[PDB]
Structure 1
Amino acid sequence: GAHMEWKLFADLAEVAGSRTVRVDVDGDATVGDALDALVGAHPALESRVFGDDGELYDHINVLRNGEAAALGEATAAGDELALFPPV
């Protein structure tokens, strides 16, 4: 599908064991779908990203190509996605 890459920081990078993670998602995959692909690649991330209700924790900052992105936004091949824990 569409290949793209996540950058992870601080404890998220530590849990994943890498500062970068490649993912490959569907053509109409959202940012949220790309985030679920990241967590599928490194399931230990799950409880550092989502609460028991499945919702993103408050204050996590998801970027797509350097701009804040909501989980329903589109993705595209070559995207640079970033996941920062709360400031």
Structure 2
Amino acid sequence: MEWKLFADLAEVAGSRTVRVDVDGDATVGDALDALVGAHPALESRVFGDDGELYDHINVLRNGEAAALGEATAAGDELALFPPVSGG
């Protein structure tokens, strides 16, 4: 029932790692896709553009089913960070 994020998306939102405690309209996947790299997490304005064809994103899950339309799920993941080597 928690997640983590890199500056890739936290650059605009300001929040990378979050935890699930309260229940509301926000679904489990609704925030997952956003936090993963939907757009609102880092604004729609790409500014310069990086590319559109393929993207890699590593995530850490406890081993549960990735739920989306079930905010009242029994957990989501542990952390989420995109690949990066070299600097």
TM-score bin, normalised by smaller chain:
0.3 to 0.5
Bigger Rg over Cα: 2
Residue segments in structure 1 that go unaligned for 5+ positions in a row: none
Q: Give me the CA root mean square deviation.
A: 6.2
State the TM-score, normalized to the length of structure 2: 0.42
Q: Are residues 80 and 21 of structure 1, via their aligned partners in 2, closer, same or farther at CA, if it must alter by over 3 Å?
A: same
Specify every segment of 5 or more residues in structure 2 that has no aligned partner in the other structure, as ranges.
none
2:37 matches 1:18:
no
Q: How many residues align?
A: 84
Higher helix share: 1
Deviations 1:14-38 (A, max 9, x none): 2331231234799999985662364
Q: CA deviation at 1:69?
A: 8.2
Residue 37 (1) aligns with residue 34 (2):
yes
- Matches of 2:43 and 2:57 in 1, distance apart? 13
Please tell me whether the aligned partners of residues 65 and 76 of structure 2 are also in contact (alpha carbons under 8 angstroms): no
TM, length-normalised to structure 1:
0.42
Partner of 2:25: 28
